[PDB]
Amino acid sequence: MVRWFHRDLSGLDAETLLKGRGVHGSFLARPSRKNQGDFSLSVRVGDQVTHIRIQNSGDFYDLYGGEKFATLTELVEYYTQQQGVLQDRDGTIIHLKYPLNCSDPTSERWYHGHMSGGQAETLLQAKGEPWTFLVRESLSQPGDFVLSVLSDQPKAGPGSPLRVTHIKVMCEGGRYTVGGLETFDSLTDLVEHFKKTGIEEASGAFVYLRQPYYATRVNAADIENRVLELNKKQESEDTAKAGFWEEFESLQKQEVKNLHQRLEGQRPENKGKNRYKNILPFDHSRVILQGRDSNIPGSDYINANYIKNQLLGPDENAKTYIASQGCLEATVNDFWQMAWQENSRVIVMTTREVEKGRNKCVPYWPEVGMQRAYGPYSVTNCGEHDTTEYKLRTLQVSPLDNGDLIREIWHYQYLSWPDHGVPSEPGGVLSFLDQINQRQESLPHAGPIIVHSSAGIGRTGTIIVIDMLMENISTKGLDCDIDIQKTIQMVRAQRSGMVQTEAQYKFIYVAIAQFIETTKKKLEVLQSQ
Numbered sequence: 001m002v003r004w005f006h007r008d009l010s011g012l013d014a015e016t017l018l019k020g021r022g023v024h025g026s027f028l029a030r031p032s033r034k035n036q037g038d039f040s041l042s043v044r045v046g047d048q049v050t051h052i053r054i055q056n057s058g059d060f061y062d063l064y065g066g067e068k069f070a071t072l073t074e075l076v077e078y079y080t081q082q083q084g085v086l087q088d089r090d091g092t093i094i095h096l097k098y099p100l101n102c103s104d105p106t107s108e109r110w111y112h113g114h115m116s117g118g119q120a121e122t123l124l125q126a127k128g129e130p131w132t133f134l135v136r137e138s139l140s141q142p143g144d145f146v147l148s149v150l151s152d153q154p155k156a157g158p159g160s161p162l163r164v165t166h167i168k169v170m171c172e173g174g175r176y177t178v179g180g181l182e183t184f185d186s187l188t189d190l191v192e193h194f195k196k197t198g199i200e201e202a203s204g205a206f207v208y209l210r211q212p213y214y215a216t217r218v219n220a221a222d223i224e225n226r227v228l229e230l231n232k233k234q235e236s237e238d239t240a241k242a243g244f245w246e247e248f249e250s251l252q253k254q255e256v257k258n259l260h261q262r263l264e265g266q267r268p269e270n271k272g273k274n275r276y277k278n279i280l281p282f283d284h285s286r287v288i289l290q291g292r293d294s295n296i297p298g299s300d301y302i303n304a305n306y307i308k309n310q311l312l313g314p315d316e317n318a319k320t321y322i323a324s325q326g327c328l329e330a331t332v333n334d335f336w337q338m339a340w341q342e343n344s345r346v347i348v349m350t351t352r353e354v355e356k357g358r359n360k361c362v363p364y365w366p367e368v369g370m371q372r373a374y375g376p377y378s379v380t381n382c383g384e385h386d387t388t389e390y391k392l393r394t395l396q397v398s399p400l401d402n403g404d405l406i407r408e409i410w411h412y413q414y415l416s417w418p419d420h421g422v423p424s425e426p427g428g429v430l431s432f433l434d435q436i437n438q439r440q441e442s443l444p445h446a447g448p449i450i451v452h453s454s455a456g457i458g459r460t461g462t463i464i465v466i467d468m469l470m471e472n473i474s475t476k477g478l479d480c481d482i483d484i485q486k487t488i489q490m491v492r493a494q495r496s497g498m499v500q501t502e503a504q505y506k507f508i509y510v511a512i513a514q515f516i517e518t519t520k521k522k523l524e525v526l527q528s529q
């Protein structure tokens with residue numbers, strides 16, 4: 001779990017690393033300078049960093065008294081799961097929330113970091129192709145690595161999965177070696193060498209490296225190096241336009257295993273309620289409109305889905321979303337019904353009213369000073385603010401029969417997204433989103449952020465994914481786990497075809513990349529107190 005542990009780190013610079021980059025509950029593990037051979041657990045507590053000694057007797061890992069562990073990983077996971085109380089010298093109970101990662105030793109995609117042999121074995125065997133390789137951390141010997149390669153020999157009899165050989169990669173003296181005569185400056189150099197020559201091994205047998213098993217898990221802080229790698233149009237098969245294309249094709253080709261019920265949207269009574277016949281909400285995740293007759297077929301229908309971060313820890317809160325389509329003339333009143341029942345206080349519109357003389361969305365707000373009734377709800381446009389990229393409308397909605405239940409609704413309309421493709425730079429969207437995030441966070445009781453475009457798939461999907469990933473970095477801090485392909489796959493499970501084009505897919509990468517840089521520079525100005 002996560003790419004923790006550092007190899008050449010001392011307490012003094014471990015503190016500055018945690019205090020500068022990490023938040024509360026940030027932690028990492030490194031070898032102890034004092035008492036050599038043992039380990040240290042550097043944990044962040046508010047603004048102060050505390051260090052805890054870990055005993056390595058060769059048989060067990062403990063904190064000099066307390067339950068013992070086979071591996072250092074077992075010790076950490078234990079206290080992370082809170083299966084035992086962690087307390088430092090004085091007695092203060094310490095909590096292990098978010099780990100702080102070391103940089104990826106290589107920018108190459110075949111590196112998976114902290115992964116057990118069991119895991120490594122399974123997904124390699126799954127591929128099936130012999131001499132498929134993977135580089136990972138060594139869970140047995142903390143400070144080493146493992147080159148997990150799939151042999152051309154079955155592990156059992158015939159028809160059994162192929163055997164996995166684990167070549168231990170050592171980092172003795174800051175140089176990489178497989179225990180042989182030659183050493184390397186970097187893993188990339190080591191791997192590239194053994195691709196040509198092959199790994200011999202004492203017995204005379206051979207292990208070759210022909211095709212890499214790619215990872216998508218990337219350390220958030222080093223996403224810039226990944227975006228450079230994914231731009232490279234390299235492939236053994238030849239003519240595979242970019243590495244971004246392959247990652248996106250993985251998602252697009254996985255749509256065959258996504259046949260789920262969309263019956264309610266296909267009702268004849270709902271035909272005019274969809275902007276597109278082929279684009280419909282999954283029945284399990286569709287927003288269901290309240291206060292309708294039910295004996296009128298399809299009265300509860302709106303083309304919208306609840307979308308939330310399913311790849312997030314137990315009982316830990318985050319932003320929830322609703323991905324809707326741009327309002328049609330008929331659906332206008334239903335939109336507000338949804339907005340009311342879900343208690344949404346922020347709305348994100350990622351399109352213009354008219355694009356190239358073609359309907360993408362019709363307005364559902366009165367103009368400044370005006371007050372219009374939308375079904376059973378009254379809404380007033382209390383003010384408009386114009387920015388380069390976006391338009392902020394301070395809306396005020398309430399029911400008609402009452403009126404004491406007035407709610408402030410902040411409407412954010414992005415009107416700088418090009419007709420073809422994606423924005424030129426990601427800077428506008430980041431500012432746009434930053435303001436949206438601050439709004440929702442300032443409103444504790446606020447329901448899901450409604451995000452809508454035209455079909456509510458491409459532009460909205462892109463926005464949600466970026467925003468989910470941003471929050472993930474704002475909550476866990478940078479130097480954290482990020483898998484963009486998986487995050488998308490997770491939101492695609494809740495609404496069909498989130499993120500439509502490769503350009504949008506790449507936009508999410510470059511967006512977080514600039515976000516990660518502007519996070520580095522905003523800690524550059526603070527630095528020390």
